[PDB]
Amino acid sequence: KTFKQRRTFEQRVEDVRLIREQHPTKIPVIIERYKGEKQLPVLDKTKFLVPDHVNMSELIKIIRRRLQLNANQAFFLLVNGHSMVSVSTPISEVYESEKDEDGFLYMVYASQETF
Ligand SMILES: O=C(NC[C@@H]1CCCO1)N1CCOCC1
Numbered sequence: 001k002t003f004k005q006r007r008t009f010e011q012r013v014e015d016v017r018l019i020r021e022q023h024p025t026k027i028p029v030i031i032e033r034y035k036g037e038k039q040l041p042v043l044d045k046t047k048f049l050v051p052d053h054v055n056m057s058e059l060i061k062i063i064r065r066r067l068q069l070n071a072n073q074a075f076f077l078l079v080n081g082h083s084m085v086s087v088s089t090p091i092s093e094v095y096e097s098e099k100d101e102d103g104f105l106y107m108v109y110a111s112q113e114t115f
């Protein structure tokens with residue numbers, strides 16, 4: 001069901017190396033709905049190539065637009081399992097400290113801060 005379940009560590013590693021080769025300016029992001037989530041829709045895809053200059057605040061706006069949310073639906077984004085310390089950090093910096101050992105940056109969204 002989840003990304004890590006669907007692909008071998010070997011397969012996730014090789015895919016990241018290919019994004020490096022073909023999309024060198026992009027951060028490879030996995031974005032998944034919280035397994036408990038009732039309110040928000042599922043995304044149309046799992047794997048996102050994010051321009052490495054956007055900050056976390058802009059990435060939240062991007063996903064809220066992708067989900068076509070309205071102004072009073074809540075949305076919380078976890079990175080590498082935990083809350084974002086700041087939305088002003090550039091995703092290139094977030095990648096280097098939060099990336100998985102397979103080389104993806106793993107995010108999860110929910111309508112509650114309590115996931
Ligand atoms: O996956 C995405 N785009 C892939 C790009 C577009 C052209 C080459 O690959 N995006 C969704 C998340 O926001 C950034 C854009």
Ligand SMILES: [Cl-]
Pocket residue numbers: 022023024025026
């Ligand atoms: Cl690129």
